[PDB]
Symmetry: C4
Subunit: 388 residues, 4 copies
Amino acid sequence: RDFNNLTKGLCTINSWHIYGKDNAVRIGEDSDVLVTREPYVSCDPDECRFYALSQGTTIRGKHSNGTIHDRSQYRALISWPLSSPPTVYNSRVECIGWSSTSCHDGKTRMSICISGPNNNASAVIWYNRRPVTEINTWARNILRTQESECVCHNGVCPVVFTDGSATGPAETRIYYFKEGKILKWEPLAGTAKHIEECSCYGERAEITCTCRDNWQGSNRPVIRIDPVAMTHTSQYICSPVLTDNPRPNDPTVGKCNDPYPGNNNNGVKGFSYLDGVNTWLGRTISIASRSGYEMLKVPNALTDDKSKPTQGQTIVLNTDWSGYSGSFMDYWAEGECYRACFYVELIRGRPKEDKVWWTSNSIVSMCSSTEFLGQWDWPDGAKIEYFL
Amino acid sequence: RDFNNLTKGLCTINSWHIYGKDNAVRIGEDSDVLVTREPYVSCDPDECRFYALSQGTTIRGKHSNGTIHDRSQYRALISWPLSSPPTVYNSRVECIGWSSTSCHDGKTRMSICISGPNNNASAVIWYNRRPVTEINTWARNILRTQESECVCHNGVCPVVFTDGSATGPAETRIYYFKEGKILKWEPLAGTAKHIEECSCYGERAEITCTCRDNWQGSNRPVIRIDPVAMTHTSQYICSPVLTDNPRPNDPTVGKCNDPYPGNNNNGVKGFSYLDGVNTWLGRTISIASRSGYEMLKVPNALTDDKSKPTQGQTIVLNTDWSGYSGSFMDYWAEGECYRACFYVELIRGRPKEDKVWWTSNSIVSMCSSTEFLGQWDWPDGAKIEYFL
Amino acid sequence: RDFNNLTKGLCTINSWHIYGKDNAVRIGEDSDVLVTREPYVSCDPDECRFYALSQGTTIRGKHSNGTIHDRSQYRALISWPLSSPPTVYNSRVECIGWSSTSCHDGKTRMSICISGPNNNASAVIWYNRRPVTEINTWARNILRTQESECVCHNGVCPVVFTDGSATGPAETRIYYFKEGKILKWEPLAGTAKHIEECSCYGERAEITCTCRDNWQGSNRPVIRIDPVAMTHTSQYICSPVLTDNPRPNDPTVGKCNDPYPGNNNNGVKGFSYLDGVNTWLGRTISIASRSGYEMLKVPNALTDDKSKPTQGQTIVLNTDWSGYSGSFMDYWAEGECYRACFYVELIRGRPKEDKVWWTSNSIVSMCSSTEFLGQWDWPDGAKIEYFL
Amino acid sequence: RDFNNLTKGLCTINSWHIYGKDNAVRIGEDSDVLVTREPYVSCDPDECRFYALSQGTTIRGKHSNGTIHDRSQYRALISWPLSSPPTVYNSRVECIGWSSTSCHDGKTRMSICISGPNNNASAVIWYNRRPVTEINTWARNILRTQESECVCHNGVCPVVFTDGSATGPAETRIYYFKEGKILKWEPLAGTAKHIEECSCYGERAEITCTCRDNWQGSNRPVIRIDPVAMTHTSQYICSPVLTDNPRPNDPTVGKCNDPYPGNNNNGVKGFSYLDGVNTWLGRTISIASRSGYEMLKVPNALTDDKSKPTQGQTIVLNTDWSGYSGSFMDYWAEGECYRACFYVELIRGRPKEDKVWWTSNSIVSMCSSTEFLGQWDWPDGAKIEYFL
Ligand SMILES: *[C@@H]1O[C@H](CO)[C@@H](O[C@@H]2O[C@H](CO)[C@@H](O[C@@H]3O[C@H](CO)[C@@H](O)[C@H](O[C@H]4O[C@H](CO)[C@@H](O)[C@H](O)[C@@H]4O[C@H]4O[C@H](CO)[C@@H](O)[C@H](O)[C@@H]4O[C@H]4O[C@H](CO)[C@@H](O)[C@H](O)[C@@H]4O)[C@@H]3O)[C@H](O)[C@H]2NC(C)=O)[C@H](O)[C@H]1NC(C)=O
Ligand SMILES: *[C@@H]1O[C@H](CO)[C@@H](O[C@@H]2O[C@H](CO)[C@@H](O[C@@H]3O[C@H](CO)[C@@H](O)[C@H](O[C@H]4O[C@H](CO)[C@@H](O)[C@H](O)[C@@H]4O[C@H]4O[C@H](CO)[C@@H](O)[C@H](O)[C@@H]4O[C@H]4O[C@H](CO)[C@@H](O)[C@H](O)[C@@H]4O)[C@@H]3O)[C@H](O)[C@H]2NC(C)=O)[C@H](O)[C@H]1NC(C)=O
Ligand SMILES: *[C@@H]1O[C@H](CO)[C@@H](O[C@@H]2O[C@H](CO)[C@@H](O[C@@H]3O[C@H](CO)[C@@H](O)[C@H](O[C@H]4O[C@H](CO)[C@@H](O)[C@H](O)[C@@H]4O[C@H]4O[C@H](CO)[C@@H](O)[C@H](O)[C@@H]4O[C@H]4O[C@H](CO)[C@@H](O)[C@H](O)[C@@H]4O)[C@@H]3O)[C@H](O)[C@H]2NC(C)=O)[C@H](O)[C@H]1NC(C)=O
Ligand SMILES: *[C@@H]1O[C@H](CO)[C@@H](O[C@@H]2O[C@H](CO)[C@@H](O[C@@H]3O[C@H](CO)[C@@H](O)[C@H](O[C@H]4O[C@H](CO)[C@@H](O)[C@H](O)[C@@H]4O[C@H]4O[C@H](CO)[C@@H](O)[C@H](O)[C@@H]4O[C@H]4O[C@H](CO)[C@@H](O)[C@H](O)[C@@H]4O)[C@@H]3O)[C@H](O)[C@H]2NC(C)=O)[C@H](O)[C@H]1NC(C)=O
Ligand SMILES: CCCN(CCc1ccccc1)C(=O)[C@@H]1OC(C(=O)O)=C[C@H](N)[C@H]1NC(C)=O
Ligand SMILES: CCCN(CCc1ccccc1)C(=O)[C@@H]1OC(C(=O)O)=C[C@H](N)[C@H]1NC(C)=O
Ligand SMILES: CCCN(CCc1ccccc1)C(=O)[C@@H]1OC(C(=O)O)=C[C@H](N)[C@H]1NC(C)=O
Ligand SMILES: CCCN(CCc1ccccc1)C(=O)[C@@H]1OC(C(=O)O)=C[C@H](N)[C@H]1NC(C)=O
Ligand SMILES: *[C@@H]1O[C@H](CO)[C@@H](O)[C@H](O)[C@H]1NC(C)=O
Ligand SMILES: *[C@@H]1O[C@H](CO)[C@@H](O)[C@H](O)[C@H]1NC(C)=O
Ligand SMILES: *[C@@H]1O[C@H](CO)[C@@H](O)[C@H](O)[C@H]1NC(C)=O
Ligand SMILES: *[C@@H]1O[C@H](CO)[C@@H](O)[C@H](O)[C@H]1NC(C)=O
Ligand SMILES: *[C@@H]1O[C@H](CO)[C@@H](O)[C@H](O)[C@H]1NC(C)=O
Ligand SMILES: *[C@@H]1O[C@H](CO)[C@@H](O)[C@H](O)[C@H]1NC(C)=O
Ligand SMILES: [Ca+2]
Ligand SMILES: [Ca+2]
Ligand SMILES: [Ca+2]
Ligand SMILES: [Ca+2]
């Protein structure tokens, strides 16, 4: 009908309830399930769907061998019904590529896939299921994007891309699209030193993205975007509760405008909801590997450099594998406020479970409740020995 | 369009005709069929569908091992087209959980799934395919619900939950929802001593639920609900024709307000249509196990403590397995009265058939006819030796 | 929109062109294809579909063993997209039973399935996908129907049933339904001595059915029905070109009102288009088994007892298996006249091919052309040795 | 809504971006994928789909043995969602045949399939999914057509057929259809000596087809059609950059009205976009086999007999297999001009890869960009050793 506008604020998050779970690897042990990674969730005005980058083979298929590799010509952004597994028969291909983002602006959906050699990649923006705009690599070193949904406001959907080194200063740009066309683009501003895989959400006409400093920070960079003025700024989450992975142990005081040193050249896509006292951070439990997952209420994490948790909820136990995590919200749900949601990628196979030759994942997603619900852990559930 | 109102009374039930049957286990022997249990049937204004709690694996899949277990993080309420089997590719996930109920109010469908640890479970009410309300456990001992459809009247859909001991007094509540929000809730009233898995239907602005006293009764408790006044009362079916399982042999006189003693701490979800002389009870043929299934016309069973059958129809022979059974009706069918219907879960595998390591089921459902149709038996049809 | 009326006459049939073919057995050798038999084709105002009675198992599945049996509780009328195979995932169940018919009246579709023991069978009429009317067996000996589509005119859809002996006089009735309700029923009139599996079509407000005299006739009985007056009459096709199977060799002169003697207690469902000089009969090539299939133009076959073919077209070579065949037409196609169509069931497995333990079929269907198209043969195409 | 009119001209083609890729053979190694060949892509006003001629068996199925054969009764034109593989469950059959073309005129789609013995083949034209017109063979030697989409203008959709010798003069006709009926047909005019498998596109009320001279030309014939006047003319592409296969090495000067001699009785379906300086030719890299694929910008190739490439883009490396290629465009995309697109069939199996007994393909398709995008190669991706 009409372009969606971010007119509400977030609901109070007192706990998280189970939203969707696909049990993809359990089911894929004996069904035609596609090998995937880098999944996310994204809603249209009438339906919410699971998304991920397919590897172009089933798990049980012989071509699953080698799916630890990130970029190839056999990957594609696919979407499928909520809580179903990504099967060969119920999956819709959005575009061809090895990096992506996608969002509905209220009228229709824009999907962006990037493909190519490391030094000659290109992004093709699809709108209403047709290619509309194409952007060629500007730094010649793996043009890449969010790996989770973008957000729009009155037709304008900002998207964060990064081109260049994964372990040094790189060239990050914020593009502002409207109906698939580029309205404008900015170079990154503010104090964030490196940006990768931003996880975004919007409320009260402002867009907040929590990204990943793959270079030196263990605290996460944040990009606040103004989709009307088409401007932005960046900094790091101030809290000592560190959310990247691998990372050092939490200190007593964090940093607001500099990376917190400790681990270099590594990380994991993550997110956060930054809303004053209504602030919740997500992180792996393990400081060493992508293992376990918990949500921690850390009042004013963004600005208070000594903020510590006042409440929490375990999502995945530290004995189970986790992986990427990002934000999304059903901006079209009935109600007075936006209900915050998130997904966690549960990676199985290589590199941790080396008995199999593949790497794939299942998904678990939750949404906030104003109630204080009891907690449960939500692991992948597959038994690797069944695949040997 | 508009909220459905229970304006008709039941049609005369002179016999039962075959409505739907999925042959899930026969077909699943060589197709990607999901392992399920606790199925039911539920209609929308334009289509009737099969529902059940998936175990998150196919029957032939290696993860089918162990599906005798009731609660895990891999279960989900799924729905699929009438008479089709629950396959990985044609199944729609309604919500994540190990206990459920669902009903269409005329405008849209409300689905409720409960998940969690035994001591910290929670129910999340979905309406129009979005989470709306969440209720946390109140007795800390397996919050659970109907396992068959709820019923609505003018927007109000009562749902019966039980939290606490399965073998002692517990805390049962009747919630009255309208568009996913709680309008009110009551503690159980009347003489029923224990309530579990209520099977409900509605006619002439009143809702009747036949439940299961898992503690001491072999006669079944009934809850009559008034969805306008939002009040209810309870008692037991008076008839000596006992319908729980396991149960003692039928006596010559039954009890109206007390459990009929004999078997303790066990039972099976069942139902009945209580309509004066137009009364039919369903029960397993075996008094010892969930074996066989028959419908018996027992005039005034609800109130006459010496009522005995005047007619009957065998649905499943006593040599074949049965299981749960519940009521539903297509409240949107053309016609002068509501046609009573029911389904029977045909459980295969553990515990009775221990040669396989899984537990699953198929479904058979019938609806009433005003004609006196000839009868046939409707067993599952799968040959277990084919799975060894 | 509105009830369809048979306002046109048939187009001139100068040859037959390929309409649809599913290659079900070839494909089912390595796909989840359902075992079927007794197929047919039937159109709705916006789509034409393949129909058949499923055996409730896939071909490669272990339960395929024994599917030579006609009646069981695992059969169901299913429909699926034109030229696709009947797979577990793309098949829609219409009703449960081992004998059926179905037709669209212009507003919606009526489907009828019969199920039960041989002596207590019953038909349940579904209209707009809901059960509406039920008819119990009247002769207590396998109540059965057409096995191909019925035809409607202004809301009224006559259906021919037979109850009683398959090899003696039986009780055949013509029911006239309108919106699933019985308007009236007649006992068979005219000179036909036995009626089974009628194949019907309609033109210029009249319905013609070519059936099967399983008792003594090798010439086929015809029932002409007047759907407005709700009356009918019957006779046999006069031509010496015999179309039942097994049958004697063609004589020089046929019979109009008596069965042509020769083979007793056997036959095959077949059809014909009887339209003066525009008359075409279908028959197996073999007089001994269901082998081969050809269409022969026999001017005035219905009334001329010495009529012989003036043109023909081979559909299936005599070295390939055939089986049932029936008529249907897309009454909603654009055009000045109705294009005659037909399907042939290509049976594979038992009894002829005894190396496998199953019996199933694929379908080939053609429609008339006013052109004189070249011919090709259309066999099933599967290699039985691949299933051993 | 209304008939589509070719009112725009082509967009400037500065490079090609990835549009769709199905990875059919990789996926089919462990999924129910149909064996195909002769694929193409074609759009409707609201969706673009992949098309191909199925062989009526899956790749892993035993009937895949022998699919190197072109014509049989088990082939059918099928369509399926863009970038999905042609699976048994997501594929829609358009018509039965071993040669085809299809196009949407703006209101609905016309599909044409040809089937039959070599000497008695016939084409049946379907419009709005119903058979409408039938054409019988005129030269009695494999009546055949485009193998890629046709194009329409104001209701009129010309289609090029060829009947007769594949290695001598034959009888080629251009039929002009409107709503499935023949408005008129012409014998081929101009200087083209032989025509096979034309690849067409339209812009500014004119239709251009690049075909294949299977007899003596290594330069390609072009047919320009005027869909309003219903007339046409033909010639050869003048450029020395030869695009058929197998072919001689490029000379310094080409021929405009005669076949360029060198290879006889062979070729491959190909295409080109002829638009003055905005001209791009597609060709296999290898001059000997269907190996590799590249696009070359050759300004004024159609008329300049010494034109050579000024830019290029490799699509498939010469170490990977290619095959047929053709044109299509989404005539319903938003925008000021038509974006040129094309697909390449990536053939795997026989005859080149003789270790397997089947022949099948996957598809890669690209569309033009006004940007100068970096390039990547897009091979099939399957490992044949996995099928042994
Ligand atoms: C029924 O359900 C309810 C609702 O869920 C249950 O109640 C909830 O119970 C939760 C579990 O206790 C509770 O969460 C906890 O909340 C406290 C604040 O009150 C919070 O501090 C906890 O978080 C710390 O603890 C967990 C491990 O327990 C850590 O994994 C987490 O990271 C937090 O500690 C780490 O960081 C802190 C800040 O930097 C450090 O001070 C601390 O030392 C620790 O650091 C080490 O570990 C880090 C992680 O590996 C590492 O990075 C660092 O370097 C150090 O090595 C936790 O969130 C909920 O608040 C509570 N909710 C409610 C409403 O009550 C109830 O139990 C259930 N009922 C039953 C019968 O079970
Ligand atoms: C064509 O189709 C028609 C239509 O279906 C057929 O006609 C129908 O035939 C039915 C079968 O005879 C008939 O049903 C019976 O109806 C009578 C009342 O008329 C009813 O009493 C029967 O029910 C008792 O019998 C069955 C076993 O036969 C029991 O399983 C059932 O539970 C009932 O008995 C038990 O409970 C009674 C009440 O408490 C006790 O008095 C009795 O002893 C027995 O108790 C023991 O068994 C219990 C069950 O295990 C146990 O819990 C208890 O502790 C005791 O151990 C049955 O419903 C239909 O009424 C009739 N319908 C019509 C319209 O006529 C016809 O046969 C078919 N035609 C052909 C040729 O076959
Ligand atoms: C390109 O395509 C065109 C178009 O299709 C081809 O032209 C067509 O060619 C057809 C084949 O010749 C031709 O069909 C024949 O038409 C004649 C009438 O003109 C018709 O009589 C033929 O039918 C008899 O013959 C076939 C076997 O050839 C039998 O199977 C059939 O049943 C008919 O014979 C049987 O019944 C008769 C009547 O009772 C008996 O007189 C006769 O003896 C025979 O009886 C025995 O066999 C019976 C069957 O088993 C059995 O029941 C009985 O007891 C006896 O044992 C046939 O239909 C088309 O008319 C013609 N169409 C056109 C427009 O020309 C052309 O060849 C193709 N081009 C090329 C190069 O091939
Ligand atoms: C990032 O991406 C960009 C964008 O793609 C890259 O830049 C592009 O790089 C392309 C590759 O160099 C370049 O394409 C080439 O363009 C030139 C014109 O400038 C064109 O001549 C090239 O085509 C010839 O060369 C290829 C092999 O290189 C041949 O396969 C092709 O057929 C052409 O040569 C053949 O035909 C000619 C004409 O007849 C003959 O003169 C020539 O000898 C040759 O003939 C033989 O081979 C034939 C084929 O087998 C055979 O039939 C014949 O008989 C003879 O045996 C090629 O298209 C793009 O123009 C350029 N694009 C842009 C915008 O710059 C950049 O490299 C990437 N960045 C990085 C870091 O890699
Ligand atoms: C830092 C995150 C993105 N990068 C670095 C890409 C890069 C490598 C080398 C040089 C420059 C850039 C990653 O490797 C991501 O890592 C991970 C990962 O699990 O950490 C998976 C992503 N599939 C991958 N992204 C891409 C495009 O390959
Ligand atoms: C009495 C019916 C519900 N209960 C008891 C739950 C309970 C156990 C122990 C203590 C308290 C409560 C059951 O076990 C039901 O039994 C059966 C059953 O077949 O009898 C299957 C149901 N899947 C299960 N329900 C749940 C939630 O697990
Ligand atoms: C004559 C056609 C219908 N009959 C006879 C049914 C009957 C048997 C014995 C006594 C009375 C009636 C058939 O056997 C048909 O035969 C055949 C067949 O291939 O000849 C298949 C049909 N599936 C079957 N119909 C039914 C209902 O079983
Ligand atoms: C020249 C292209 C079409 N022909 C020649 C048909 C023909 C043969 C012999 C005599 C006359 C005509 C082809 O063989 C095409 O070749 C090829 C091919 O890969 O070259 C595949 C096509 N499936 C096939 N077309 C048909 C209809 O069979
Ligand atoms: C969003 O705001 C714009 C004007 O700023 C308005 O035209 C549009 O309809 C609004 N969207 C909705 C969904 O109301
Ligand atoms: C149900 O009754 C309410 C008023 O009590 C009415 O507004 C509604 O339309 C009724 N529903 C239908 C389906 O008529
Ligand atoms: C069929 O005829 C009836 C009246 O006899 C008419 O009301 C109906 O609309 C007609 N059907 C169509 C499709 O015109
Ligand atoms: C099929 O069943 C029969 C009888 O039930 C048995 O002897 C036969 O061996 C079975 N065939 C196969 C392949 O299992
Ligand atoms: C195409 O042109 C015809 C008239 O020449 C017109 O009637 C039709 O609507 C046009 N099509 C569109 C899509 O405008
Ligand atoms: C395929 O068929 C040929 C000839 O029909 C046969 O020799 C060959 O072995 C078959 N190949 C396989 C793998 O079955
Ligand atoms: Ca980091
Ligand atoms: Ca009990
Ligand atoms: Ca006979
Ligand atoms: Ca050539």
